[PDB]
Design a protein around this ligand. Structure first.
Ligand SMILES: *Cc1c(COP(=O)(O)O)cnc(C)c1O
Ligand SMILES: *Cc1c(COP(=O)(O)O)cnc(C)c1O
Ligand SMILES: CC(C)CCC(=O)O
Ligand SMILES: CC(C)CCC(=O)O
Ligand SMILES: [Mg+2]
Lengths: 358, 358
């Protein structure tokens, strides 16, 4: 057990540099000039990290990442502030999650501080890619795959940790959800609370069926009571008047089937800080939703995540019936306020312990 | 769809020497060649290639590394007692690979063309099909999404390849199982009924946990009543006297959480034709099992799968106790009869339409 170290970084600058794209971009379509890569073996442990020109990965055909999904990823952003200072948002939480995911994937552990510094060195080198727009940013995709060259299903004796950079804009423009309870995203005892690739490949069929019915995303339902868990790849928030006639900002609890998002945490922290209404991490079902609608109790519904931050939901297609959510007709007040707060913090218009600057 | 007729063959310059068919570690040795077929949304399938075993050059953003957009298959080639090389139920593998491709939203292919391409790959490396009646050539068709963009969606790029690995045993050597209801392999509304990469990477944590407890495999439990579903990566079979006091061979039903193994189907077929006892596809819980043991009603328990046609079970670690299974004390009579029959068919000692020559 050990870790690679940032002070050991081997930088190899690309001679040919690619022209930056126009800030006004399709998510994950464009990649920067460089990338970070770190090899690992159970025999020699972590090798020295490298920052080199973006290039293809040369992988053995038997690599466990291609056969048994031994893999995991992360997603954070770097923002060019109104002061032109590049900032990262709550990077330390992504490193924690990534570490936890590694352990649950049986991939080799590493030192969070070192990885973060290596990332900071990667972004710094390609800092000119960080968009020159207050509505765009640079997406950081840390990835960790098993490269064991054997078909035996088991803990990998070889692995590759790498990091890609992609300048992006959007991932309000409300979305419509497709809710089919026949499809299940995560289960108790599963890995839904980790960012392991295995939990995503199996959702593509559902996502396709969603676009097949005019929806932009999938509303993941769970259990006999059809609990509302997540919106596609985002955590779900419901701003309504609860059963007790109280103004409430609710979101499903972290009971195993919900991925603990960094945006989810922040929203809950801002929501608690303001102390203007009740904040509850509890169970929400379709019936709770419908009963509330046929009472004008609902105010806003939206998804949260690094890619969208705040993503208003306006309709849910459930049991052949299109269920409209008055999110947009009520502002969206909270959703907008939350967007401004996070955006202000991310672009340096507001000082806070949530961002770091190199 | 690609066509076998279009195969482009690039034979290796230097051929590796064959391993000892007596000391083979499952899936660690690979033959001289592999099959590769590139797919693109814009152009469709490229022509198929049989070229020397080399590393795959993939864009670091390939969806197979990020979102487990991948699936695999497993079938074997056997050198018969007449020295004729045979494939066992290969068309069933093609059908399962095809259905899984659809569920993963990977591109469809002509099942016969793939099989012919595989036969031609095996024909080229035919000398790798071990001169042994206790060894064979494992065939690993693999289908991965190579989509460069980081968006979670249906791939517009993909690769289909086939590797070959001479093998002997996956590990009668009875195995002990580690049963802990805290982990769930697959769930209703899930994808556990497909050979999609995502279902395995999530198992490693439980698997390594079984090892540090002396067990070679995990006994996958499901639900409040703790149904016993599969033995590691193999289907589960129970030979006992049931509640009604009847002699019976039972195996969990295909209700969505069980992978329809080819071996499993074959065993049910053989058991059905012998018609010497009741054959049931039914639920089985730890309680039925432990209650049956206390009643001395259990005879044999074993896992089945291409890697280990019949893998007898001797012990189960559950609730801190070690539940002994009398399988080996009972012969294992049925386990042997079945193993003997399947191998007699595979190695041509018996003719049946379950094997395809060359
Ligand atoms: C990444 C992800 C989220 C959001 O987490 P953030 O850290 O806020 O980006 C939510 N749900 C799923 C399933 C995710 O993969
Ligand atoms: C492949 C597999 C089996 C066995 O099926 P065969 O087609 O008979 O090899 C059983 N269970 C799981 C989970 C599998 O992946
Ligand atoms: C799953 C990732 C491609 C996007 C996560 C998000 O920010 O919602
Ligand atoms: C999962 C694979 C490595 C083995 C499947 C089997 O033969 O049971
Ligand atoms: Mg044809």
């Amino acid at each position: 057990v050990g870790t690679f170290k940032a002070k050991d970084l081997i930088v190899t600058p690309a001679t040919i540099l690619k022209e930056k794209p126009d800030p006004n971009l399709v998510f994950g379509t464009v990649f920067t000039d460089h990338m970070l890569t770190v090899e690992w073996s159970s025999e020699f442990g972590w090798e020295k990290p490298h920052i080199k020109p973006l290039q293809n990965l040369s992988l053995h055909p038997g690599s466990s990442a291609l056969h048994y999904a031994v893999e995991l990823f992360e997603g954070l952003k770097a923002f060019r502030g109104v002061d032109n200072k590049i900032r990262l948002f709550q990077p330390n939480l992504n490193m924690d999650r990534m570490y936890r995911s590694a352990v649950r994937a049986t991939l080799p552990v590493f030192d969070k501080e070192e990885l973060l510094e290596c990332i900071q060195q990667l972004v710094k080198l390609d800092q000119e890619w960080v968009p020159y727009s207050t509505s765009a940013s640079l997406y950081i995709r840390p990835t960790f795959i098993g490269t064991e060259p054997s078909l035996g299903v088991k803990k990998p004796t070889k692995a590759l940790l790498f990091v890609l950079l992609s300048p992006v804009g959007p991932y309000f423009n409300p979305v419509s959800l497709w809710a089919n309870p026949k499809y299940v995203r995560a289960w108790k005892g599963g890995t839904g609370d980790c960012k392991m690739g295995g939990n995503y490949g199996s959702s593509l069929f559902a996502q396709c069926e969603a676009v097949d019915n005019g929806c932009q995303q999938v509303l993941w339902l769970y259990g006999e009571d059809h609990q509302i868990t997540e919106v596609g790849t985002m955590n779900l928030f419901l701003y309504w008047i609860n059963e007790d006639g109280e103004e409430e900002l609710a979101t499903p609890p972290l009971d195993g089937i919900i991925l603990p998002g960094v945006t989810r945490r922040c929203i809950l922290d801002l929501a608690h800080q303001w102390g203007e209404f009740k904040v509850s991490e509890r169970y929400l079902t379709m019936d709770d939703l419908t009963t509330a609608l046929e009472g004008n109790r609902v105010r806003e519904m939206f998804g949260s995540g690094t890619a969208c931050v705040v993503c208003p939901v306006s309709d849910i297609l459930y049991k052949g019936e299109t269920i409209h959510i008055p999110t947009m007709e009520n502002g969206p007040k909270l959703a907008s306020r939350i967007l401004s707060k996070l955006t202000d913090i991310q672009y340096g218009r507001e000082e806070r312990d949530w961002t770091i600057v190199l």
